[PDB]
Design a protein around this nucleic acid. Structure first.
Ligand SMILES: [Zn+2]
Ligand SMILES: [Zn+2]
Lengths: 126, 125
DNA sequence: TGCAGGCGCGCCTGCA
DNA sequence: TGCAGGCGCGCCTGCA
């Protein structure tokens, strides 16, 4: 199973309840990418950490949030936290790479959730 | 024994040598907190993971490091790694909570080693 | 520069 | 209370 394989790349140490949620977050993404034929690209990006992979997109919601098992969050934040930065606190800490065509900030009909298309930046000035 | 009970809360999977070191690190802290009457507060913070605990302090050294059984480290890093984040890289990955009065960064005469007074952050950009 | 690690005096413990 | 021996904080050297 691709879900168990992708979960093997998950960052951080989660408790029982948190583990179950992360699994639902991976299952949710896997179901979407399977329908659009982008599943192999996610496997490639996650297992190899290759920045030069294609955008991995999902439809953007009206308010930008994604709900997974009764919890809402920004999808690029969810998947960047899951596979790269477990202590990432917000989207203000993320900036998309130059080659990202569907970066969250662009506010297109599709949002790129490829964690290797984002970089961490300094928290904005007050 | 408070040492055995606090060790039961240790994070990660340690080999024989590391287990013995972790025990010395808990024994070292327990001896200091007993002398300043803070042992019950450590027990409360560790066993209940309660952020709403008092600061748990030890005297700060000239260079900030603490030596336990021939190994030196920043004491808030040592105790946060032990009870919260076993892969904690450095003090650059820890920020103290707003209510921490003796946070390591404050460089006061006393340093807070309450792991629930710190939050783990990604390495500064 | 920060930071890691070698080394010893001073403090401590456990025997006399 | 003399004395032996363990260990850490402070001082130091050297590396990234
Ligand atoms: Zn992209
Ligand atoms: Zn504190």
């Amino acid at each position: 199973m691709i879900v168990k394989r992708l979960l093997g790349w998950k960052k951080g140490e989660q408790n029982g309840q948190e583990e179950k949620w992360c699994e639902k977050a991976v299952k949710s993404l896997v179901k979407k990418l399977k329908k659009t034929g982008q599943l192999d690209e996610l496997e490639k990006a996650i297992t190899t950490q290759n920045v030069n992979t294609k955008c991995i997109t999902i439809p953007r919601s009206l308010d930008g949030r994604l709900q997974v098992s009764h919890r809402k969050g920004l999808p690029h934040v969810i998947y960047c936290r899951l596979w790269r930065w477990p202590d990432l606190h917000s989207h203000h800490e993320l900036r998309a790479m130059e080659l990202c065509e569907f970066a969250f900030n662009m506010k297109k009909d599709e949002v790129c959730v490829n964690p290797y298309h984002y970089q961490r930046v300094e928290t904005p000035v007050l």
